[PDB]
Amino acid sequence: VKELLEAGVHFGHERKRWNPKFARYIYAERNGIHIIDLQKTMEELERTFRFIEDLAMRGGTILFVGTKKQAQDIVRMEAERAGMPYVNQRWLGGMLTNFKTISQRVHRLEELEALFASPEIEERPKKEQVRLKHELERLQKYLSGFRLLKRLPDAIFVVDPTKEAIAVREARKLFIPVIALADTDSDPDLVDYIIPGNDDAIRSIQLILSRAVDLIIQARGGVVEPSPSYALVQ
Amino acid sequence: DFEEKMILIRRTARMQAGGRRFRFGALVVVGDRQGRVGLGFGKAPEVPLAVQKAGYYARRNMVEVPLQNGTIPHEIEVEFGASKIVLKPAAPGTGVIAGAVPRAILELAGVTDILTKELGSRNPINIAYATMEALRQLRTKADVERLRKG
Amino acid sequence: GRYIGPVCRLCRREGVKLYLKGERCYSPKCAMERRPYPPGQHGQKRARRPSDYAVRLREKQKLRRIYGISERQFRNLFEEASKKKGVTGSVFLGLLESRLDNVVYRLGFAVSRRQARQLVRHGHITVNGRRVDLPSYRVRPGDEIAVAEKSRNLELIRQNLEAMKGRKVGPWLSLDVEGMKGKFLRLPDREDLALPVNEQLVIEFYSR
Amino acid sequence: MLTDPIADMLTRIRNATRVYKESTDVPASRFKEEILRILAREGFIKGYERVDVDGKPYLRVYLKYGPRRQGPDPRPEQVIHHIRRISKPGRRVYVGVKEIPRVRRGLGIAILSTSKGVLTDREARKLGVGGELICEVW
RNA sequence: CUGGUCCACCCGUGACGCUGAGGCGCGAAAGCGUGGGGAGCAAACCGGAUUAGAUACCCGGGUAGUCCACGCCCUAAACGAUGCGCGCUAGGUCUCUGGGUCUCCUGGGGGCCGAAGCUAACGCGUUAAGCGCGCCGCCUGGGGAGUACGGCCGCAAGGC
RNA sequence: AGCGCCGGCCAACUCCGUGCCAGCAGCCGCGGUAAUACGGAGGGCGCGAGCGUUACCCGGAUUCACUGGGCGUAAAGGGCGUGUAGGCGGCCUGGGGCGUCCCAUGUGAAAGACCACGGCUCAACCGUGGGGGAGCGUGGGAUACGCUCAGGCUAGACGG
Ligand SMILES: [K+]
Ligand SMILES: [K+]
Ligand SMILES: [K+]
Ligand SMILES: [K+]
Ligand SMILES: [K+]
Ligand SMILES: [K+]
Ligand SMILES: [K+]
Ligand SMILES: [K+]
Ligand SMILES: [Mg+2]
Ligand SMILES: [Mg+2]
Ligand SMILES: [Mg+2]
Ligand SMILES: [Mg+2]
Ligand SMILES: [Mg+2]
Ligand SMILES: [Mg+2]
Ligand SMILES: [Mg+2]
Ligand SMILES: [Mg+2]
Ligand SMILES: [Mg+2]
Ligand SMILES: [Mg+2]
Numbered sequence A: 001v002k003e004l005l006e007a008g009v010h011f012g013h014e015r016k017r018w019n020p021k022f023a024r025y026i027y028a029e030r031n032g033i034h035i036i037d038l039q040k041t042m043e044e045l046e047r048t049f050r051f052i053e054d055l056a057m058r059g060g061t062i063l064f065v066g067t068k069k070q071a072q073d074i075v076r077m078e079a080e081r082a083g084m085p086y087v088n089q090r091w092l093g094g095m096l097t098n099f100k101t102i103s104q105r106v107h108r109l110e111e112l113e114a115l116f117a118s119p120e121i122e123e124r125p126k127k128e129q130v131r132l133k134h135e136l137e138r139l140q141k142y143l144s145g146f147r148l149l150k151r152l153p154d155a156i157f158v159v160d161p162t163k164e165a166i167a168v169r170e171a172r173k174l175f176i177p178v179i180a181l182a183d184t185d186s187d188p189d190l191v192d193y194i195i196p197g198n199d200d201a202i203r204s205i206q207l208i209l210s211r212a213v214d215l216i217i218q219a220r221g222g223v224v225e226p227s228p229s230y231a232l233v234q
Numbered sequence B: 001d002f003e004e005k006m007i008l009i010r011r012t013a014r015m016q017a018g019g020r021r022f023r024f025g026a027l028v029v030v031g032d033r034q035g036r037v038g039l040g041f042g043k044a045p046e047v048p049l050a051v052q053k054a055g056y057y058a059r060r061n062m063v064e065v066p067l068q069n070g071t072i073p074h075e076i077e078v079e080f081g082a083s084k085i086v087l088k089p090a091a092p093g094t095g096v097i098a099g100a101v102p103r104a105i106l107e108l109a110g111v112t113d114i115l116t117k118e119l120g121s122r123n124p125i126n127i128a129y130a131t132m133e134a135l136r137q138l139r140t141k142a143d144v145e146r147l148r149k150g
Numbered sequence C: 001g002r003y004i005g006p007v008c009r010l011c012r013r014e015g016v017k018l019y020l021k022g023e024r025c026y027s028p029k030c031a032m033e034r035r036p037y038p039p040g041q042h043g044q045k046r047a048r049r050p051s052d053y054a055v056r057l058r059e060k061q062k063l064r065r066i067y068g069i070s071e072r073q074f075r076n077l078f079e080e081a082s083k084k085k086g087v088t089g090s091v092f093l094g095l096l097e098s099r100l101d102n103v104v105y106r107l108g109f110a111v112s113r114r115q116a117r118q119l120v121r122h123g124h125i126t127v128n129g130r131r132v133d134l135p136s137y138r139v140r141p142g143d144e145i146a147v148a149e150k151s152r153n154l155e156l157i158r159q160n161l162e163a164m165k166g167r168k169v170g171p172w173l174s175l176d177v178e179g180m181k182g183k184f185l186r187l188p189d190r191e192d193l194a195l196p197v198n199e200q201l202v203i204e205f206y207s208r
Numbered sequence D: 001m002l003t004d005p006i007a008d009m010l011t012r013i014r015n016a017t018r019v020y021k022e023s024t025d026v027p028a029s030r031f032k033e034e035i036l037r038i039l040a041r042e043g044f045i046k047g048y049e050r051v052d053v054d055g056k057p058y059l060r061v062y063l064k065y066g067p068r069r070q071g072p073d074p075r076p077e078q079v080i081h082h083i084r085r086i087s088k089p090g091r092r093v094y095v096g097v098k099e100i101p102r103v104r105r106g107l108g109i110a111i112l113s114t115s116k117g118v119l120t121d122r123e124a125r126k127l128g129v130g131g132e133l134i135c136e137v138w
Numbered sequence E: 001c002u003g004g005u006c007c008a009c010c011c012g013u014g015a016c017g018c019u020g021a022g023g024c025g026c027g028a029a030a031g032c033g034u035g036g037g038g039a040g041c042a043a044a045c046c047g048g049a050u051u052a053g054a055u056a057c058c059c060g061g062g063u064a065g066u067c068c069a070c071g072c073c074c075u076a077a078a079c080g081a082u083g084c085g086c087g088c089u090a091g092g093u094c095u096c097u098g099g100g101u102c103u104c105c106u107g108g109g110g111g112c113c114g115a116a117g118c119u120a121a122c123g124c125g126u127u128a129a130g131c132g133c134g135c136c137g138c139c140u141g142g143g144g145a146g147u148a149c150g151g152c153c154g155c156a157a158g159g160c
Numbered sequence F: 001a002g003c004g005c006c007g008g009c010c011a012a013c014u015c016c017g018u019g020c021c022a023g024c025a026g027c028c029g030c031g032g033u034a035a036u037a038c039g040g041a042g043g044g045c046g047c048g049a050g051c052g053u054u055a056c057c058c059g060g061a062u063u064c065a066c067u068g069g070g071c072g073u074a075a076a077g078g079g080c081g082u083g084u085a086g087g088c089g090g091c092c093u094g095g096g097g098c099g100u101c102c103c104a105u106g107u108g109a110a111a112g113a114c115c116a117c118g119g120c121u122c123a124a125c126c127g128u129g130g131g132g133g134a135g136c137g138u139g140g141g142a143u144a145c146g147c148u149c150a151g152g153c154u155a156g157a158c159g160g
């Protein structure tokens, strides 16, 4: 787990509309874009990953949040590659904040998987074999990665704070630590363990999330090979 | 463990064809009389449910009041909206000199001697909230010390 | 004239048994014993959550009624209490406990306070020898409260002073059941007394 | 034109702190400098230093705050919660040693200007002197 | 013929500054006085319709006036309904006008959206309603009443 | 042994009688056949040789805000400018010491008030003793800030 010359991808992103609060993490403007200072990208990674090993080799349940379609897959990949849950489609308001309720959907999903593999699949008209067929299907477009959580995450790994602002707002609210790869357009002060980098561009997100998931197993001791998502980077 | 003092209950009204449609609001204070208090404002179709809802909300939203022999570490004034609250420390024997709203929050916080004054709008709801903030803002010498060191 | 009228009814309005009769209030009959609800036609009906005020009023009315003192006198003592140094609450109690009529009762010379009062008005009481018929007379520390020589043979005196044999008495007081003498050792501590009264509310009642 | 340079400084400080600046300059004056000494020693500001800006004498005031916080709004607590000007031009305010105020049961201070120099309410009380009650800070 | 003002140079004076009771001047429209001038428009007014009536709205006419010169009048939702000056506290975006090494920096204006913050909300937010200091003006429940009386001003109407 | 209360504020509730009547009412409001609000009764609360009413003062009232308020839309920015008095005034040094601050000292009647003991059996009432200083005069002292006089400075203002 490590890397320096990473200008191979991240560094510098977003045009000029920024957020001054993210100026410490900025090196200079070029062609109208802000070029993130990787030196600090490093500093934070260290401090951040250090937080990862910490919760990792300890039983720490991390929740991954990435809705930005520019990284929807890169999320579930590196997420499933760990007992770590994730939200891929759309972050439902109250998942963390109203967890006990948003949970009954998970308690309903699993149960609607029973009927569809029992002596009751063919019972009652299609008036249900359709209503329940869709219910179960939607309950899965969303709760595939959220399915795992038994209790609030020990931390939150967000891809774009500004986009996933609603999740972050809930983390903070619940004193749940907030980890996130944040871009030039976000507010750092809201992220507890920041990874100042290019929050857009699959090649970037994959590199960070990947190494971060490496470190996660390589922290809980499981010796695993490279990432299976380096392909979805095409 | 935790005491429950109901500051006030009200029956607001909304409008639909046909007529009025009542709802109830409840302000409930919760405290251990030993430095811990919480405020709760819950609204619901029936009073009972409202109160409970309030109590429940009161338990989240707690404040750690730094009592010093029944009194506050120092005087403070806080404005919540148009309501202002003045809290002044006092020696023993003084008692809790305050309006019903403040005292209820003060006694359950385990305050036994204090000088109080309600200024501006005396809207109970806001006067109560001004109070919580006041307490929440209280600082201890150790605290000030911690801050001033560095 | 300090009240004077149906007394085991005040016990009922305060929902607590007050000893305004001494005995009778010990034998199943202070009324509080099976009939603890307020006096009047509505006594048994369910009560409504009293106003912070009501609560404070009844508390003062309790403490005040215990010593059968007037509002006029009760207030004057409390104002005196405020002014004095030290916790008003206790100090107040200390003063109420220093009334000769009360002390007579404390020493057992009488069964109740209303009796103790009359014993004073009629000269059956002595402070350091000299007669004193002022029930509000304030007994100071070191004073010797006895029975008038001429009254030591009274029927009622013997009865009460007899029942006082073996009986213990206030840690701030001392009774020499022999010559029927007693000594006010010191002002009682709040800890010394145990009245069913939260003096804190009383102070609040007057703070309004 | 500045009608009250001290009030100006006090605010510059109040303003900078509310947005968490590092330092913040204020046109220099011995008297302002004097107050900064107190402010520093008392531990409200990390410290201050003379500095020339555009050729003109200023005073970088390095502010200090508390630690990052939990939940929503992690913004640190202020070390200087309150800093208000008392005596002002056209309404000057003086006090005898016997009238020096006790700012927040001592958890705070009051900077007075006495003929024995600028002192905290405690310092003044000690040397037994009073003067112009400049401001209060806590 | 003449006022204000912005920018660049950093050249001259050396705190000569800010505000400002009273004073003085300016002050939309209507209105007044004297003399002009009147195309169009149009209070009053003369008629035609409408209407239950229609001292209105719609239609045909039409005088003062609207325009000019001199004096007067001194009011307004005279409004940003936000007194003036200075210092301080993210940014984005559009625009007018200077200078620059003319990606875009800089200065002075005009708009919009917004950090912090403020506000009863609505909203305000470097063009503050933010954080501050200075000075002026003004408020203190509604009606009676901007009335009465008095004073001052005005030809009057009326104004303060 | 009385007097006033028992709709909310505000401690205390039932029956009957009266019906928008007769009446109550500090404020909000009660009474047009089931009135805890009128009148009576029973009951209850409060106080007690007194209890209520009226009037008047301070309080609550930061409701004129010194402590301690406001003026965009709630009452409130003068229609605008010019400018008199006045209020307010950047950076450095020096003299003075008026403001301001410190020390002594005089004055500050007695009574009253406060604390402590006492005298009338208590108390009210009274006596003795004890601190308590603000204000002003005098005499010393300090000089940071304000003031004033001198001399400097360019970052305000003005000029080229
Ligand atoms: K506030
Ligand atoms: K708001
Ligand atoms: K007139
Ligand atoms: K009837
Ligand atoms: K009745
Ligand atoms: K009054
Ligand atoms: K106006
Ligand atoms: K000098
Ligand atoms: Mg959704
Ligand atoms: Mg982005
Ligand atoms: Mg409500
Ligand atoms: Mg604390
Ligand atoms: Mg406070
Ligand atoms: Mg306010
Ligand atoms: Mg008010
Ligand atoms: Mg006392
Ligand atoms: Mg200031
Ligand atoms: Mg401040």
Ligand SMILES: [Mg+2]
Binding pocket: D086
């Ligand atoms: Mg002041």
Ligand SMILES: [Mg+2]
Binding pocket: D093
């Ligand atoms: Mg003051």
Ligand SMILES: [Mg+2]
Binding pocket: none
């Ligand atoms: Mg020109």
Ligand SMILES: [Mg+2]
Binding pocket: E010, E011
């Ligand atoms: Mg020059």
Ligand SMILES: [Mg+2]
Binding pocket: none
């Ligand atoms: Mg020169």
Ligand SMILES: [Mg+2]
Binding pocket: E020
């Ligand atoms: Mg001017």
Ligand SMILES: [Mg+2]
Binding pocket: none
């Ligand atoms: Mg001038």
Ligand SMILES: [Mg+2]
Binding pocket: E027
């Ligand atoms: Mg005009």
Ligand SMILES: [Mg+2]
Binding pocket: none
């Ligand atoms: Mg005209």
Ligand SMILES: [Mg+2]
Binding pocket: none
């Ligand atoms: Mg004309």
Ligand SMILES: [Mg+2]
Binding pocket: none
């Ligand atoms: Mg003409």
Ligand SMILES: [Mg+2]
Binding pocket: none
């Ligand atoms: Mg025409």
Ligand SMILES: [Mg+2]
Binding pocket: E051
């Ligand atoms: Mg008609």
Ligand SMILES: [Mg+2]
Binding pocket: none
């Ligand atoms: Mg007609």
Ligand SMILES: [Mg+2]
Binding pocket: none
């Ligand atoms: Mg016409």
Ligand SMILES: [Mg+2]
Binding pocket: E079
């Ligand atoms: Mg306008």
